[PDB]
Design a protein around this nucleic acid. Structure first.
Ligand SMILES: [Zn+2]
Ligand SMILES: [Zn+2]
Ligand SMILES: [Zn+2]
Lengths: 50, 82, 99, 61, 237, 88
RNA sequence: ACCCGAAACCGGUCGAUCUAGCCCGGGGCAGGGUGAAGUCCCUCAACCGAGGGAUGGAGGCCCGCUAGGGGUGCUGAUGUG
RNA sequence: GGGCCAGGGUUCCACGGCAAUGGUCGUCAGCCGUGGGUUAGUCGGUCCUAACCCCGCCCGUAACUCGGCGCGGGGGAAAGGGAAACGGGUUUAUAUUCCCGUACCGCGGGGGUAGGUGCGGCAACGCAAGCCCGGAGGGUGACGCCUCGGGGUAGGCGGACCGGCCGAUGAGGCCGGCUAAGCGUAUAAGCCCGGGGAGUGCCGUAAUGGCGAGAACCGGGUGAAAGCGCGAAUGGCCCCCCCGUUAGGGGGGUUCCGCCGAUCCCUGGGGCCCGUGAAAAGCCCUCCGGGAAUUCCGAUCCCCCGCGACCGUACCGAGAACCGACACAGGUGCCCCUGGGUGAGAAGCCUAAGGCGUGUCGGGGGAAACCCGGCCGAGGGAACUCGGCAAACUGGCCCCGUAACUUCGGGAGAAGGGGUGCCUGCGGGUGCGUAACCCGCAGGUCGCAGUGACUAGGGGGGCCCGACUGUUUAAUAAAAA
RNA sequence: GCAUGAAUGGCGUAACGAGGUCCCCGCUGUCCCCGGCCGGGGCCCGGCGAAACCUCUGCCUGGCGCGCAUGCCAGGGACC
């Protein structure tokens, strides 16, 4: 964990950037149709694939 | 150094049996003595490893028996070869 | 602010140490370890033998004893005849080996 | 033993890591091959007709 | 049924493999082309304890520049000179062809065929006796008591292997046995077939007795040769 | 401490800094003294040090100024005598 | 072959982070006791010998809530913990 | 409590919040939202090789992605080997990485010098002691277990003195009184080198021991951890004063003695193995051949200058940041470290530093019966029960004393008996010491009880089985197996 | 010796054992014979807030009955 390879670090970075909420303007544009995406994650409950 | 019978096998206490203790004591008593050096002729030979002996005065190192510097077969072959 | 540390005082310990130096708090009812645990064996022998060797060398240097007597007393000290240099001096006085 | 206390010793090196060829986390790191596509053990892909995973990948079953 | 220990040993698993990386190396003679028709002189540099050999080893440096490992004979001295070849003098630690070794001599490390490197009489405390010499063969009495014929050109070393009497002292402790057998990775401790299960051994069963005679035929298949194999007789005579 | 420093091949020393902090200093152990090639007794004139310490010194401060510095004086004199006698 | 249910058999593959064995490289075990081999010393006698005093630290040794490891009894608590 | 792996992957920091999550509430949060945060020539990977693995040729197989010996190549350790940095300061969150100060290592260059062509010692050796290419040898790297002596450093204790606080502006107690790498500098043991020539023997150690194959004894050489000097008092720490509306500015000191002393470093002995406790890279030295050099070549020595790539670096590190579905009393990691008193003790108990009141639902109560955990119980003392299950007795230390049997080692702390506090004063051991530790003696005195709490064996006699230490059914059997 | 026996070993055995077994001193709430006291639950109040399980129901005596009925027959009793 202290010592990390660059490729694994980049994959973790991609997952971290993925984990965020749907934009409010996206919700407004879709008219309350798109409220969430299947990539939401909680670091202590749902773990990463790697 | 003051034991009637156990000798070197006194470290075992009351274990391993009379015959085994006697054999260990006899072998160790014969081994841990000082033996005559084949080179300098003085009693300064000590066992370094199994079958390896070294003199403490002149530093001569030679190969011998497991527990004695010379075995009967070694003595016989040395006598034959002269 | 940084509050000052409330250090632990050693006044009672100092008082008890003074009383023990005088001779108090030292009876058989205040000991928990073995006698050899309290005053070990190899260290006691080392102190005794080193004191004896130092005394013998000092006497030889002052020439109060000869070389043969020094050798004999060295052998006796190694053998453990003398438990202290008071006994060593008692032996010297008794046998008249001091000049 | 054999249960909850046993499961606490999973803090060592993982058995399988990500594979550079197929992209799945199935590469046997100690041995040096992939348990899914056979990377590091064969030039050709590991396909078995009793397996439906490669068909599931492209919805061809 | 399940496999036997002997059956599992033949698969070469690390449970049964010899740890041939902590040892000092194989003890073989110098190639026969050097020894034939020429005599080489070497000096003993060091005598060491080989972890698994049952005999001390020695390092010999020859005048041609070759460094070799030999089995040290009893009485071998560090810094002494030795000779290998047809013209070598008859002394302990010298290697000669069996044709040049006088009868009644003690030898060890005898080549089965000329130039193989030595195969016989290598354990500690062992020696062989030269019995007769002929232009076609040389007879030697081996430690097992068998009289064996060797080619006259087979090489042997004069003397007795150091380390004899090793069995005079008992092992005493299971820990001592553990260290002794772990040094060479020999299967220890060992179980008993009578206390094994029926699935595991021919003698296995709930009652701890062999259900059949313990003398097994020479023609028995693998997985069956247990007990006394092709025994001519049993018991104490 | 780190697992690399938990190894006993490192020398650990507790040091107080000028600012009042307590820190641990780690060092590698020095090599043992050189030994004669023939008898194995310690040599003279060869300082002990790690490769950096050895490279920190000039050439003449690492070995004595006499023939065969890899041998103790007794072995050196013996070898010289044998060579001289063998030449004649 | 109206519908559901077996224990089981067979092929190809996946697993020694649990656990079993073995190999290479590493970390650890407060304090105390007993006193084997070994090395001796002193006194009285001397044809024998007898007595006293040391040193030495061995052990699959002993006591031990050191750390660590194990799991005998209470068939104790808990036993939708 | 402090540090930090694996694993987790943003959980780290600030601000703005309480719809949901948190065993209750919540204005709080490891939760939600919005903005941020990980800076290296010196730390680690990167290099070497170990157990071992892969690829090519080859052989087998109907064949292969399957099996395999031998040759050639490669890989393989973030706790093995292995070039080089340590203080102070700075941010909300990074610092051996940023800033300041002082250094070191590798490569390349410039100017000098030693050497090429130089000396001092009987010697051990002291020395700047030529450059470039190739090879060989030696050393180092490089090693087990047990045990002891010597040297040193952290840390601790007592006393003096200067500031501050408390105390009664009494006695006394407490707090601060600090010093990194790097550079220069030398002795101890061990091993040597000259002189010297012993035994009705001398010499030495804790112990073993050494001597005409060269001892006492007199000189010297080489050789560690450390200490000392610069770094370094313009720094850090403590105290005092003026300004204090915000914001700031100055003045003082930071010194000695004695004792203990490591599980932390260095260095030597001894003992044990039917057990022998890694390799290679790298570095140092020496020796062989070859090449250039005279109005010239040229350093391992001095000064100066330039360059030094890629990746990790936040945070927890666990009775809430890992695994076990959980903010799980388990496991991983107790993996590395520990002030004072009592005490043999890293035991128990109290306490300093540090941390916490989050091993997280609170309030009430003679508010019962009953259950779990704990204390006591008159007379009897196993009459209970399958069975003394459970509980109880004993308990540390000192001194007397100790059986059958025996493998002579043991049994054994057998059994059994006496003493133990406090105060006053002497004597002894080692010691220069009226420093420190330990061992005795006499007297006085108090209680029911003096190992007063804490710590802390009950014991003995027959029989069966297995010699013993050890191993086993992870999750009903620990045994005679 | 229903039906022991000599390396599927026979007999004996010091030391050792959380192994099975009998006895003795001492000790005690194991017991005669149980009684007090403390802390946590239990109980009440404010909060969060389930699960196992559930044909519908649910009083007795003597009987019939697939032979031991809350539910049928004859009696008895019963406010929620
Ligand atoms: Zn000799
Ligand atoms: Zn793959
Ligand atoms: Zn030499």
């Amino acid at each position: 964990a202290r010592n990390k390879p660059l490729a694994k670090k980049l994959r973790l970075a991609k997952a971290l950037k993925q984990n965020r909420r749907v934009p409010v303007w996206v919700i407004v544009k879709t008219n309350r149709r798109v409220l969430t995406h299947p990539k939401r994650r909680y670091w202590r409950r749902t773990k990463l694939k790697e | 150094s003051g034991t009637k019978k156990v000798g070197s096998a006194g470290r075992f206490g009351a274990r391993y049996g009379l015959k085994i203790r006697r054999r260990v004591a006899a072998v160790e008593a014969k081994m841990r003595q000082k033996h005559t050096c084949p080179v300098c002729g003085r009693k300064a030979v000590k066992r370094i490893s199994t079958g390896i002996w070294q003199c403490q005065k002149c530093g001569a190192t030679f190969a011998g028996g497991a527990y004695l510097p010379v075995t009967p077969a070694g003595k016989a072959v040395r006598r034959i070869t002269e | 602010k940084k509050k000052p540390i409330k250090g632990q005082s050693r006044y009672r310990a100092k008082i008890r140490h003074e009383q023990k130096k005088k001779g108090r708090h030292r009876g058989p009812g205040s000991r928990k370890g073995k006698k050899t645990a309290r005053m070990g064996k190899k260290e006691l022998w080392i102190k005794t033998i080193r004191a004896l060797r130092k005394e013998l060398r000092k006497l030889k240097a002052q020439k109060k004893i000869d070389r043969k007597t020094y050798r004999m007393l060295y052998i006796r000290a190694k053998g453990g005849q003398f438990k202290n240099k008071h006994q060593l001096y008692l032996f010297l006085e008794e046998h008249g080996l001091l000049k | 033993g054999s249960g909850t206390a046993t499961f606490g010793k999973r803090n060592s090196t993982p058995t399988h890591i990500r594979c550079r060829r197929c992209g799945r986390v199935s590469y046997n790191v100690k041995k040096g091959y992939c348990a899914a596509c056979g990377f590091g053990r064969s030039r050709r892909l590991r396909k078995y007709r009793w397996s439906k995973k490669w068909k599931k990948k492209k919805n061809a079953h | 049924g399940k496999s036997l220990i002997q059956q599992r040993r033949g698969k070469g698993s690390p449970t049964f493999k010899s740890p041939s990386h902590r040892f000092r190396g194989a003890v073989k003679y110098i190639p026969l082309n050097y020894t034939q028709e020429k005599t080489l002189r070497g000096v003993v540099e060091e005598i060491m304890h080989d972890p698994g050999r049952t005999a001390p080893v020695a390092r010999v440096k020859f005048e041609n520049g070759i460094e070799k490992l030999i089995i040290a004979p009893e009485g071998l001295l560090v810094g002494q000179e030795i000779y290998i070849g047809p013209d070598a003098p008859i002394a302990v630690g010298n290697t000669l062809p069996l044709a040049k070794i006088p009868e009644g001599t003690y030898v060890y490390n005898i080549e089965g065929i000329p130039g193989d490197g030595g195969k016989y009489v290598r354990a500690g405390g062992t020696y062989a006796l030269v019995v007769s010499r002929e232009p076609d063969k040389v007879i030697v009495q081996l430690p097992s008591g068998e009289l064996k014929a060797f080619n006259p050109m087979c090489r042997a070393t004069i003397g007795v292997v150091a380390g004899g009497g090793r069995l005079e002292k008992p092992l005493v402790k299971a820990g001592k046995a553990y260290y002794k057998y772990k040094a060479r990775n020999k299967f220890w401790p060992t179980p008993r077939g009578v206390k094994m299960n029926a699935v595991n051994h021919p003698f296995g069963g709930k009652e701890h007795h062999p259900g059949k005679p313990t003398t097994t035929s020479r023609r028995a298949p693998p997985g069956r040769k247990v007990g006394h194999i092709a025994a001519r007789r049993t018991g104490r005579r | 401490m780190k697992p690399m420093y938990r190894s006993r091949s490192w020398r650990r020393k507790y040091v107080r800094t000028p600012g009042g902090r307590v820190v641990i200093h780690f060092e590698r152990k020095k090599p043992k003294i050189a030994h004669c090639a023939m008898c194995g007794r310690p040599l003279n004139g060869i300082p002990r040090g790690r490769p950096v310490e050895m490279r920190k010194l000039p050439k003449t401060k690492k070995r004595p100024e006499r023939p065969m510095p890899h041998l103790c004086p007794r072995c050196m004199r013996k070898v010289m005598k044998e060579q001289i006698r063998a030449q004649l």
